[PDB]
Design an enzyme around this catalytic site. Structure first.
Site, mmCIF file in Angstrom:
data_model
loop_
_atom_site.group_PDB
_atom_site.id
_atom_site.type_symbol
_atom_site.label_atom_id
_atom_site.label_comp_id
_atom_site.label_asym_id
_atom_site.label_seq_id
_atom_site.Cartn_x
_atom_site.Cartn_y
_atom_site.Cartn_z
ATOM 1 C CB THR A 184 26.851 -30.721 -25.189
ATOM 2 O OG1 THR A 184 26.195 -30.828 -26.459
ATOM 3 C CG2 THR A 184 28.337 -30.372 -25.536
ATOM 4 C CG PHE A 186 22.731 -27.684 -23.774
ATOM 5 C CD1 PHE A 186 21.790 -27.269 -22.837
ATOM 6 C CD2 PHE A 186 24.066 -27.570 -23.458
ATOM 7 C CE1 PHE A 186 22.178 -26.744 -21.647
ATOM 8 C CE2 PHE A 186 24.447 -27.080 -22.247
ATOM 9 C CZ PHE A 186 23.510 -26.671 -21.345
ATOM 10 C CG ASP A 188 24.600 -28.842 -28.519
ATOM 11 O OD1 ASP A 188 24.612 -30.008 -28.959
ATOM 12 O OD2 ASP A 188 25.389 -28.569 -27.590
ATOM 13 C CB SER A 190 27.192 -31.779 -29.646
ATOM 14 O OG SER A 190 26.215 -32.714 -29.210
HETATM 15 CA CA LIG Z 1 24.320 -32.180 -27.650
#
Ligand SMILES: [Ca+2]
Ligand code: HEM
Ligand SMILES: *[C@@H]1O[C@H](CO)[C@@H](O[C@@H]2O[C@H](CO)[C@@H](O[C@H]3O[C@H](CO)[C@@H](O)[C@H](O)[C@@H]3O)[C@H](O)[C@H]2NC(C)=O)[C@H](O)[C@H]1NC(C)=O
Ligand SMILES: *[C@@H]1O[C@H](CO)[C@@H](O[C@@H]2O[C@H](CO)[C@@H](O[C@H]3O[C@H](CO)[C@@H](O)[C@H](O)[C@@H]3O)[C@H](O)[C@H]2NC(C)=O)[C@H](O)[C@H]1NC(C)=O
Ligand SMILES: *[C@@H]1O[C@H](CO)[C@@H](O[C@@H]2O[C@H](CO)[C@@H](O[C@H]3O[C@H](CO)[C@@H](O)[C@H](O)[C@@H]3O)[C@H](O)[C@H]2NC(C)=O)[C@H](O)[C@H]1NC(C)=O
Ligand SMILES: *[C@@H]1O[C@H](CO)[C@@H](O[C@@H]2O[C@H](CO)[C@@H](O)[C@H](O)[C@H]2NC(C)=O)[C@H](O)[C@H]1NC(C)=O
Ligand SMILES: [C-]#N
EC number: 1.11.1.7
Length: 595
Positions: A184, A186, A188, A190
């Site tokens: 991803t 973003f 985030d 991941s």
């Molecule tokens: Ca990510």
């Protein structure tokens, strides 16, 4: 155009639209265009691709073809002539800790992965590439130049397989070829949780309602957890010490075990999630497992964005920081959050920051044992030195007390990576990361140095004299043109990293622009950016401002002495304080009340 709706995503997902949580794949972030930023989609193109045949054949493939009138030089030759050096003395960064290099790598893994191709459940060309150096289909070998010592010892080439690409997996023929981003866009976390639902669910501890991540059941670090073993054979981590039989770790990202210090931070992050989930269970005894997972996860995502934007970026971009990343004004749904193809090369400035050794320090921050300092090449895919040789504490202290390597026009990339890299599929510590970076730019259709100088509103060198002035180095400019024969043909990676560093930063003007605009986009195009009203409550954000990497260590290790500002160079013990002096993350704001 060529198809506006093409590809092989993750199939059947729909948006909740009033759900507090990010999806695992990144879908549903942008309401209007749900796939934006999602994983397993094409890397974005900020400029049109440059291929030998305009569509997919990289420059360097056909021998009689030129780029602007000239042959492109071999990646390994550029590596031998520009990138290598012998003396590791005096290369350390006097004001950046080793954690500066290592966080770069974490952030990178969270943002972009461009996998290689298979369509070979058993292949035999996978051996035609290695064994014979035959170019063809997705084998695009790095050939050794005349007078390369690896000739004497290694063969005629290093095998190299082209990056995976969208729509299919098959040879094809639609739009120009676009590589995939399997994670991803973003920031985030991941890399801790996974970017696909299947991996994400496998990493979780679903045996209990506690919202925990699964931990290794065979080994412990003074009562603290390790990630799961990735029990798929054959294992690269097992191969390096046939005898220890210690496999690679399982994390949300497949590269987690590439090097020991990377495996180390992945472990702290895993440990922090479980810590968080325990803490939220004492506070909210009524929460179920899903809520514990998601809430812990959301916090961990905010910690990574904060450390990244508040402590890390300002010292990479220096005086250029505000030029490219102004203060946050809120979420802008018109901003494209995708990671661009060129950013995955620009973010590789980090390769020049890796030193030749890694150290283990004891509790007084002194050499741990008789083999305290180790050459980097023996730590690729090496989990046994962790499990069987001290746990992560001595590694963690090294990250704080040692320095990163400084980018130096005359000393670019250490021989540990340039001559002795270990690739998880092959068996030798004999590969060249630099040459691989150059080959990859070509594989990915990158425009040349001048095209990017123009994109960034900077002057474009047309002459040796011009390149001299931009690089501020006569000798580097000349070897570069002896090889490329025009500035226009210089591969983005080597060109970008050759520029002198902007004031109080660690990258030059070109890279500062590429990096800068990309980071601005992922923050402004993120609906779940931590500062966006509605994601967290005001009281929750007042707690989050106080996080630090130093605290993360105190809560998840037995290191009891840490510096207040972990990214800069820190000396022991003047710059080291006791953990009690470092701010904790206060979770009372996450106390939920019923009635
Ligand atoms: Ca990510
Ligand atoms: C071993 C490797 C490292 C440490 C000893 C290392 C380190 C970094 C730093 C510190 C980075 C950023 C600050 C960074 C960025 C990116 N890398 Fe690199 N890296 C090691 C090894 C590799 C290997 C092997 C690759 C793949 C090379 C290929 O093209 O086949 C690699 C890549 C990248 C990458 C691109 C990832 C992607 O989008 O697919 C970075 C942004 N690193 N590394
Ligand atoms: C080693 O690097 C350090 C960080 O790169 C550097 O100190 C930093 O200097 C910046 C400004 O250049 C300062 O940033 C902010 O800090 C002050 C605190 O007095 C704030 O009030 C301001 O808002 C300001 O923007 C910091 O003073 C400091 N950064 C941090 C977080 O420590 C050192 O100078 C470097 N050491 C050497 C020898 O060069
Ligand atoms: C999923 O979470 C489960 C709940 O936490 C967890 O079970 C816990 O596992 C540990 C050891 O694996 C146990 O700790 C015990 O260890 C020794 C055994 O040598 C015992 O003598 C002690 O009683 C000590 O508590 C926990 O007891 C156990 N907790 C419960 C409630 O069962 C699983 O390990 C987790 N699963 C994965 C894959 O991570
Ligand atoms: C493969 O990994 C092995 C560890 O899993 C490692 O062997 C281990 O490392 C050293 C031997 O070099 C030993 O450490 C010390 O142990 C005792 C007391 O602790 C001392 O008396 C010894 O002299 C030694 O210094 C470990 O015991 C040893 N373990 C075993 C079973 O051999 C190998 O070094 C690794 N090999 C390679 C090539 O990486
Ligand atoms: C969201 O960002 C967008 C896109 O950058 C901004 O919209 C326009 O962007 C173009 C391209 O630079 C320019 O014309 C202006 O910067 C913007 N248009 C105008 C004239 O307003 C936009 O500023 C952002 N949206 C919000 C609400 O801030
Ligand atoms: C570096 N990966």
């Amino acid at each position: 155009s060529w198809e506006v709706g093409c590809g092989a995503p993750v199939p059947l997902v729909t948006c909740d639209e009033q759900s507090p949580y990010r999806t695992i794949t990144g879908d549903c972030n942008n309401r209007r265009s749900p796939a934006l930023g999602a994983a397993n989609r094409a890397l974005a193109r900020w400029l049109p691709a440059e291929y030998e045949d305009g569509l997919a054949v990289p420059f360097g493939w056909t021998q009689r073809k030129t780029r602007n009138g000239f042959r492109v030089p071999l990646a390994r030759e550029v590596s031998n002539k520009i990138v290598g050096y012998l003396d590791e003395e005096g290369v350390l960064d006097q004001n950046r800790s080793l954690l500066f290099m290592q966080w770069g790598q974490i952030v990178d893994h969270d943002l972009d992965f461009a996998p290689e191709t298979e369509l070979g459940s058993s292949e035999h060309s996978k051996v035609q590439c290695e064994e014979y150096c035959v170019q063809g289909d997705e084998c695009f070998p790095i050939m050794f130049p005349k007078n390369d010592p690896k000739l004497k010892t290694q063969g005629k080439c290093m095998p190299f397989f082209r990056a995976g690409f969208v729509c299919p997996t098959p040879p094809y023929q639609s739009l120009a070829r676009d590589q995939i981003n399997a994670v991803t866009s973003f920031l985030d976390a991941s890399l801790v949780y996974g970017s696909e639902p299947s991996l994400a669910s496998r990493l979780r501890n679903l045996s209990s309602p506690l919202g925990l991540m699964a931990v290794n059941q065979e080994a412990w670090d003074h009562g603290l957890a390790y990630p799961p073993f990735n029990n798929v054979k054959p294992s690269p981590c097992e191969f390096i010490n046939t005898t220890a039989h210690v496999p690679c770790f399982q994390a949300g990202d497949s590269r987690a075990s590439e090097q020991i210090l990377l495996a180390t931070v992945h472990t702290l992050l895993l440990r922090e999630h479980n810590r968080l989930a325990r803490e939220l269970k004492r506070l909210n005894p009524h929460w179920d497992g899903e809520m514990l997972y998601q809430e812990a996860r959301k916090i961990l995502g905010a910690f990574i964005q904060i450390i990244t934007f508040r402590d890390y970026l300002p010292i990479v971009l220096g005086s250029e920081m505000q030029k490219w990343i102004p203060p946050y004004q809120g979420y802008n749904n018109s901003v494209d959050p995708r990671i661009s193809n060129v950013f995955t090369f620009a973010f590789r400035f980090g390769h020049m920051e890796v030193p030749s050794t890694v150290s283990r320090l004891d509790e007084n921050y002194q050499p741990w044992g008789p083999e305290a300092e180790l050459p980097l090449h023996t730590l690729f895919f090496n989990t046994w030195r962790i499990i069987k040789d001290g746990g992560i504490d001595p590694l963690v202290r090294g990250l704080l007390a040692k320095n990163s390597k400084l980018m130096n026009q005359n000393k670019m990339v250490t021989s540990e990576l340039r001559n002795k890299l270990f690739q998880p599929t092959h068996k030798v510590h004999g590969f060249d990361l630099a040459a691989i970076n150059l080959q990859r730019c070509r594989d990915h259709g990158m425009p040349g140095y001048n095209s990017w100088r123009g994109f960034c509103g900077l002057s474009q060198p047309k002459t040796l004299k011009g390149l001299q002035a931009v690089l501020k180095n006569k000798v580097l400019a000349k070897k570069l043109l002896d090889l490329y024969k025009t500035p226009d043909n210089i591969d983005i990676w080597i060109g970008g990293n050759a520029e002198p560093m902007v004031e109080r930063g660690r990258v030059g003007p070109l890279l500062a622009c590429l990096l800068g605009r990309q980071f601005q986009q992922i923050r402004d195009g993120d609906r779940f950016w931590w500062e966006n009203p509605g994601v967290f409550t005001e009281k929750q954000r007042d707690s989050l401002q106080k996080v630090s990497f130093s605290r993360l260590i105190c809560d998840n290790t037995h290191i009891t002495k840490v510096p207040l500002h972990a990214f800069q160079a820190n000396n022991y013990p003047h710059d080291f304080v006791d953990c009690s002096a470092v701010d904790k993350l206060d979770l009372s704001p996450w106390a939920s009340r019923e009635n």
